[model samples]
Target chain A: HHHHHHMQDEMYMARALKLAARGRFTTHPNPNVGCVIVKDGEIVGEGFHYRAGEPHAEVHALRMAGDKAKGATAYVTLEPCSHHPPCCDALIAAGVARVVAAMQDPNPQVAGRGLYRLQQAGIDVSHGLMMNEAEALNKGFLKRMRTGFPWIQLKMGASLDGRTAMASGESQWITSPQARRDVQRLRAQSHAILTSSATVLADDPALTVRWQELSADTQALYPQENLRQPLRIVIDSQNRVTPEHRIIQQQGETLFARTHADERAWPDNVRTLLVPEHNGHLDLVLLMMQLGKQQVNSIWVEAGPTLAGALLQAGLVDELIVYIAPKLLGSDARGLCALPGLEKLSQAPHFKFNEIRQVGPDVCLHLTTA
Target chain B: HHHHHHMQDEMYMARALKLAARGRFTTHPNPNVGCVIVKDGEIVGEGFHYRAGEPHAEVHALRMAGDKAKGATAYVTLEPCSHHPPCCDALIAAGVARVVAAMQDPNPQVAGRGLYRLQQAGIDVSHGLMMNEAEALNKGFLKRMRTGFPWIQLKMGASLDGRTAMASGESQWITSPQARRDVQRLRAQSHAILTSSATVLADDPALTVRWQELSADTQALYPQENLRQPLRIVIDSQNRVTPEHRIIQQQGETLFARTHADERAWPDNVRTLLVPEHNGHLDLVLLMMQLGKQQVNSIWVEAGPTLAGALLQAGLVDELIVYIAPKLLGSDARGLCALPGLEKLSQAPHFKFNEIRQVGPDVCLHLTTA
Candidate 1:
């Protein structure tokens, strides 16, 4: 009978996790959360947190439950937050019988404290139900809270042979249009877009989020007026980027990280940060720490092979997303990462494949450090 | 309606094609063929061609049908061959009223002559039923008959980033054990295994068929006593291959296509063929033509980047099979093909993806000339 009830808990927790994903596009700094209030094996109310600084998921669910909240069990994707209204206090005052959480909140202020408060109020509290799923849902939030740096994802588009460009450097478009549009969603979800000065000077990409380019279903989730643009960051150790660059003239804010400050006047939205040089390049570790201080929770690196290799070598890359177009560009074309050649295969960095799927005319591979 | 009969024809033809694939591993130097005889809307007989010089598909089907073959319709994956006891005569003698064939024989002796004989004998003959499928099943046989050279398939195993080996050349195994075993089936299906002197000197591969390594299901179709080994061919323009090479000591015949013959005493099964050097390498076209004269229907090239690239550049490759392991070997690692750097993407050789599926931990990509 206990095993039967345990299976039911998992089913309800899985649904709550699904609801949490509804806020994926908008949840930044704060982790996405969902709450389900059940009574007599039926869901009486369900809600997911829509944005940061808004009412918590439990509050919205409890409001909908009203008087029915009494003697009910609540399934939450994360531990009830001890925030402005203190979700634990709200659940306690509502006279709920039990609380089932996927994982304990990783926030320093509420680390196990919310569950402790619920237990003190005579409520049956349990957590670590579906911890891995909950942790995956808030990878950026958890990384930012635990480590002072944001989770970094490297994005690359190359031919089936792993060539990024022709020998002569002609690479207008390697992947399909649909794949390019998919990158927009990746950009919208990230807090900052990190690139190299070489990419900015060669391609002059604006690196701004274009909601119109997203799929109809995705666009419906993010309203135009409510959409947030990711900050554009260029690692220009040599101060090579000029004011005429498209990234500088773009509508969104842009930041240039260099070894030393330059005297050239910059636009109001543009800012410069001096990062100490490390082996002739701006220190990437210190740069990520600085971004963390600025509340950047996730950094998407869409740069050339040099910067991509540097990040991997520095052990700063958390995930890799590669779009492989179904075409052969031969051996002379440019490759993906430009790390120094290893004398042995064991010295090479390894990645474990997480997902492989077809994206239009190309295949997308998602992997993480192994 | 005519549409109704056409759909039924397609259904029966599809079944015949499936049966034809059953003979894929054993039907060498002969096209894989299957036949099904239907009487009163019920299958009375079915058979597939198993090996060269054995009973043809139509003969076996007609024998199984016996008296039920009278006035029955026959669906054959290929036109009845005009062999020792011409299958056309056997079907006619069995009184099969209607003959539906997927495609005409590509052999010059038979060609459309077999179908014409059936029509002249008052047997209702309709050719080109699911022709594309039948053509695909006999691509090597069709190419061998139509052209003066056998169809060429290049096989490569590389990392997800298209790197074939580490910079230090330690590449004993890149793909999974399952993928390596899969290559044995490819070797078994080909008429010859072609390689370069560089590969022979570097790896000293025996290039012998290992039937014991095949899956149980595949092994059941091939009896050890009846198995025919593929001929091993080496492109040694400078006569670099020594008599002590493993390929020379193997249990099969080995042929060396060189610019000039050397004085080294080779084993009884070893032979040398002079192929005039084109530029700096042996003339691949002439070498293939010489193999064609030896009745080689298909050649599988498992060579280094230089040979693979040269074949593609010379427009000699008919198919490409790539086993891509889920790993990343950075830019400095050895690549797949070593074609001269092209100035434009337009100069790159293109291929159309025929199939993509996961084979163990690696992904197998089947492609053909576009």
Candidate 2:
């Protein structure tokens, strides 16, 4: 009888994990999570973490359970957060007799303490159920929470000859429209879109998650109400960005990291951040630490060759997204990354492709460090 | 009952077409043709045109059939060749009850003539069954025979950044092993392999299709008794290739086109041809016309950036085969083509990929002009 009940509990936990996946593109900084409240082998309520900083999975499930939550066993994809004590207290208040967790939180603030607190509250607690799968769900968030830096994905589109742009710097359409739309989805999932000062001056890009690229149904994912645009970040050592730039005019959170401490008049919404410089360049490590403090879980760099080369040199790029167009721009054009005087083929950085797929006419290669 | 017999005859022709495709990467100048001798739904003999200058498909099937050819229905993917009267005579002399052909040959010499001869010989002859497939099989050959000049395929391996070689001209290895082997198969299929004098002076490449690139298993496909190699061609305006050069030393048909009319001693097997020069460069059109007279079905140009740029500028490149490596060679390296002063993106040559596929870690694009 006990074995059969355990099987039922596992089945409900599996259901919770599946629901968590639905929040993959919306949830960041915080782990995607799902919750199920059960009483006498019957599911009373279920909910999933849909977006960041919104009501967590537990609270939503608890509210739906209502009176049925009395003496109910709760199945959660991740450890219930003590940081959101009101959520934990609500579970306690709702009389959830037992809590079965898939994995313990990796964040220092919670970790195993969430489950420990529930145990102290005279509630039965169990963990490490489908733990690997639950941990995998928040691989990006877990990396940020533990290491004080978001998972950095370096993205660049280059010609068959590896050129990012022509000598004239006219790089509007390297990849196909499909590939460009694919990048929008990558930005939507990320917490921030990073660019270099040179890129800002040259392109004046509006680094917002434009819903126009998406279909009518997909555009509904970012409705007019509570539409989320990733934080726009520019690494400018000299504070060269002008007020008239597209990024500055855009309606979204923006940060400009520069070397100067002098107070510069900035737009009311745009924040100017000062970071220490090493060898006349702003320290990338310090900028990432600050981004971590701001709860950035994943960052996508859509900058030019100069910034791309530097980040890879600093060993900060965790993942690489390369969009390769079939055309050749020749030697006069600029490459994806600007390395200073690489002599031999052996010295070239090599990577294994994690995934290779065609995005319209162009090829998209997802690579991780070998 | 008539429909069922027609369907079975069509099925046999489809099998014959399948056999013809096996020669796609081997047969050239000569149309890829297949033959099947079938009677009462049982296939008695089958054969395909395997290589150039070899016995025609009809002869192979008739030889294989032997006594079985008597009263058997012959299914030919193409009309029996009158050009090779012995093969057509053997088919007529074999005493086959009927001949079902896929299509009438498009070659002016053989168009309807071979079918007429078989009909005049009192043999039952029918055509236009699986005609489309048979026409497709010899599209390259038909295009060459009617137009005089072979379909020119310009092939190159470039870095993802579009660089074909380093500043020092070190381009021996760029794409993966599979892509290189793929090139060998391409060479085996082409009628002529062309290169520039600049490439010869720098790399000393043996332009011949060396059977060593294929493994023992693949080599078995083409028995050593009749190994085929493309006509090695070099466009050397100054007659720079030496007697010790790999292409000159190799035991294969070679054609060296030089600008200067002065007689130069060459290797016993090497043919030194004089071509008219325009603005200190050999006229590519004249050179192509010479090759066309020699019955070259398809020419694959594996040359440097200078030659590639000139070919594209001359508007002579029929097709483009680009093998793109994932690695970047940076801006300092040489590009796939060198078009001097290409002012804007709109002026750039545009090509749409007919087929895109992974060639090991590299991507190979088969493109035609957009």
Candidate 3:
């Protein structure tokens, strides 16, 4: 009977973890979380965090459960955060019999305080159930708290042969519309989209989220009500970006990371971020640290070969997402990254395959640094 | 009742097609063919052609059925050939009441003649049952007969980003063991393994099929008793190959297609085929035509970048098989092919995805010309 009850506990925690993933594209600056109130081995209420500044998962679940939450057991993906309307106080007031958490919060403000308060309130409290899944759900948030750097995901679009563009510099529409739209969803999931000055000068992209362009299925996953425009970060060590750049004209905030501050007046939404230069390039580590300090949890990089190579060489890339089109542009075309050539095969950067799927006429490969 | 009978005919023909595929790796210089003899809506006998000069599909099925085939309906993937002890004569001798062929044989000696002979004998003969599948099963043979050229399949192994080797030319392993073993199965399926002098000089590959290294499942598919060593053909336009080369030292027959005759003595199994030079390169079309004349139905290209590019540019590649490893060797590494840079994207070669599967840690992509 005890073994069966333990299995039930794991099953409920797994459900809470799945609920947590529903907020993956909208929960920036806060950890994605979920809560379930169960009474007599049946879920009375369930909810997941949807966006920042909104009610946490516990509040929604408790509200939906109403008086039933008084004697019910609570399963939560993360330790209840002690924000303005403290979730611990709400659960204590509701007279919940017990509380089970997948993991303790990584934030210093609520590391163990929320569970300690529940214990002090005479409610049974336990944690570290399905902890790995809970941690993965908030990996970006945990990385920000522990390493002072945003979790970086470098995205690239190239042909099946890895060619980015023809030698004549023509590369319009390498990937299909479905793949390009998928990129929008990835951008929406991050705190900011990072790019290089070369990409900006060559393409003059707006880099803003357009909900109208997303597929209906994707839009359903991330509703328009929860849409948040990701900040645009451009690395222009030489101060090549002008005030008239399309990125600057966008509605959302844009940050220019440069080695030297520009003297020109910029729009109110645009700001210049100065970082020290190392060996003729802006310090990438410093740039990520700055973004982390600004409370950015994750960054999606969409840049050309030079910047992509520099970040990879500096060991700043955490994950790589590549969209491979089913076309062959022979070796005379530009390649994915322009790093210094390695002498031995063993010296090449290693990545482990995380996921691969077809999107329209292209295949997307997700890999993580090994 | 008529529709039901038609459906049954399709079901039987589909089963015969599957049986035909069992001999894909062994049936060389002969079409992969299968036959089923059905009496009273029950399969009385079934057989497939296994090797050249072996009993054809019809003969085996007729022999298996014996007296039962006297009033049965016979379904065969290809029209029976008219060699000595011809398949049509055997079927006629068996007294099968009806004969159905998926397609007419492309061989002039058998084209329409086999079915005509069956009709002449008062057998209810028919053709074009499952014509597409039957033709696909013998695409190599049909291509050789119609175009006077062997069907070409170019195989390449590269990193996920499409790098074939590191800058220092160290590429002992890019794909996993399983992928390399799969390549051996592909080599076994071809009539010849074609390569260039650069690959010979760089890798000194023996270019021989190693059955011991193959997986048990693959070994079962191409049993040892039916093993036929594929001929090795090397393009050494400059006559750079020496007796010391590993390819020449291998046991199988090796053909060196050169632009000019050499004075050096060669092994009896090794032959030099002279061809005219065009634009500093030996004429590729002429080489393929010569191989076709020699009854080579299919050629598998395992060459370096230069040769791969030349063949693809000349529109000689019929299919492409790529093994992509989950590794990142940046732009400085050697690419899959080195073609003259294209100025417009429209000029790029297009291919349709035929198949994609994971072979161990690597993904194998099979593509055909579009």
Candidate 4:
């Protein structure tokens, strides 16, 4: 009777991608991905990427849905593994009848192999719905797994020639006042915000959700249901993260993590997590997986190129979001990106673009595999 | 005859581009371009787009090179115009034997017509030398002439998913230390550095060119002895700028003759000019004319999507620079660029990109017409 039900969750698969983002990223180097247990035509239960080494999105959703999950369809961001190693065995054991994913698992370890497993398990699977958005969202982790390097994304506010700021830090408002408001909105949309510890020590910024007027206006362009204030993330793996940091200053409820061995009681607004170190430095890659486990889905890591390099090297990135201002940051040699040991890399040839479009004075891009 | 050609001082067209930059974007609606005059396989003089409506690159370089320019091979970024009301006549009169350009003016108004005029006069012409660099350098002005809208660029630093910073602005050093250092050097290679006024006010930055160290000895990059620092520029047209502004507070006779009017005749460090404001707003479109005059051979515009929208609408952007932070900006609206008043335009058409490469943790994109 349910033979024709293979595509029953077509629309639900598409919608679940957006909703699955609710899962937070906490565990090491793994995203806190979410999934929905759809039995027949109903969403029986929802689950997300939870704490480290815990149940996955599908497993958790299935567990909560109980027997109802048996003839159900699943919507996951990444492919369900067919290989037994990375927890796909458990998913297979649960006997999911159908699986719909927003994107393929980029990790060569899974990806194609994962799809194979699901198919072998006699489950229905459909993929590539709203893929651009979902894949872009996971660009960081995907890039890492495939290329054995984290995807590099250089975020800069500059003139046309690629300067982060003119001269000193004088890049305040290059666009119109309205453009600044838009920037604030952009800040609010991210999952995790990152910067150099140096920037924090120097700027002491409070990288909080801005744009009160837009939110207050009754004619707000964005509907209330879609509005949200993104999470606050920092790249200060060292314990140097100050207690009096501007963002942390006011946002006591915010979570703050570090990689130092010395642990101390944190105030309410700030919570800290200690992670493993690599190359005498904290492993941002591992931290990313942790963040993913914590349900920090669709992360936005903002910082200079070093950490991006680390993440890229660790193969933890997916898409690239680029911004180009209209001034010149001549041959001064101080750029947003640098190739250290790879001086002979020949500009590292790899470019898989998702979209190239204009926003404000900036031309925005989303790139996954290059 | 000791014919030791001063190749160093006589960088065929480099001198022209440098001279053109002196005018400081006085030629809005025009390109902030450069031209070089070479003679006897050596170099003579150079010039570029001069202050608003003053002269084209050929005329300016020819005037400076004078009699030495006879029989010289002109290496220009664009084809020598044949039918231009002013430029064509000057090239004809310059008495140059051959002309090499990066690309020809693509505007139906001038495309190939300039070459037509030159061929009629029996001058040699070669194109596409360093075309990629040339195109990237003038992406802004060229974009506008090709389309009715302004050239757009997106500038951002991200981990991998393209987050600007931690949600609380606690992100520091997303990229490698080497990458940040490289950005400094890259900035120096630019003609002018520009940004939104908001970036300035919020940060109170001094957009100056700073130095950073590179691990390898990569000194053979250029033969030109140029400044270690790039010029600083800001995009505040309303004269709301304060004396304390960083770019405005710099040395080296800055250019102020833009779409927005301001007090002129400041110290050589901060020369200012004012132009016709479009629709009570500073027209970034016309800013290219001034960019040409200012001798700003290259520009980088960095901002959120609002500015991206304005410039894209004006059709001035050239490429996209995306920085994918490891984290995600949860809100899809926060991805790369933003378009204000999107309702007024057709459903945004997709874009076609020519190049996407990684720079440090950031991704650099060389996109083409959408």
Which candidate ranks first by lDDT, i.e. highest?
3
Q: Judged by TM-score, which candidate is best?
A: 3
Individual DockQ of the candidates? Answer: 0.59, 0.41, 0.69, 0.02
Q: Candidate 3 residues A1-370, lDDT tens each? A: 1335788898889998889889888888788999999988899989999888889999989999999887889999999866666999998888798999999878666688989989988988989999999988888888888999899999989988999999888998888998888998788878889999999999999988889878787787877776788889999999998999899998878999999889999999998888988788789988888888989899999999999888998899999999988888988789998778556788778887778787887888888887
Lowest-sum lDDT 10-residue window in model 4 chain B: B326-335
Model 1 local distance difference test score = 0.86
TM-score, cand. 1 vs. native: 0.90
User: Which 10 residues in a row give candidate 1 chain A its minimum summed lDDT?
Assistant: A1-10
- Compose the digit string of candidate 3's lDDT tens values, residues B280-363: 889999999988998889999999889988999889999999899988788878899877855689888888776778888888
lDDT of each: 0.86, 0.81, 0.87, 0.56
Ranking by lDDT: 3, 1, 2, 4
**Per-residue alpha-carbon lDDT of model 1 for A1-370, expressed as tens digits?**
1446887788888988888888877777677999999988989878898888888889989999998999999999999976656899999999899999989878666688989899998999888999999999988978987898889999989887889999888996778898989899888888789999999988888888888898888788788887776888999989899988889887768989989887798888999887887787689999998888878889889999999988988889999998988677889889999887556776777777777777887778888887
**Candidate 4 docking class:** incorrect
Candidate 4 residues lying further than 4 Å off, grouped into runs, are A1-154, A174-190, A211-231, A252-266, A275-298, A305-316, A332-334, A345-350, B1-370
How close is chain B to the truth by TM-score, in each candidate?
Answer: 0.89, 0.90, 0.93, 0.56
**Candidate 2 off by > 4 Å:** A1-18, A36-44, A65-75, A86-102, A108-110, A113-136, A220-224, B5-7, B24-28, B86-89, B95-98, B119-132, B168-172, B210-212, B215-217, B261-264
RMSD of each: 3.3, 3.5, 2.6, 19.0
Instruction: State the lDDT of candidate 2 residue by residue for A1-370, as single tens digits.
Output: 1345677878999999988876766776567999999988789989999877688999889878999999999999988877655566778889999999998877566688888888989999889989988988887788888899889999988766577778897776878898989898778878788998898888878988877786565565555565578888988898788777889778877888889843566677798788888887899999889888888888889998888888877778888898877676655777777667676886666666567777888778787766
User: What is the docking quality class of candidate 1?
Assistant: medium
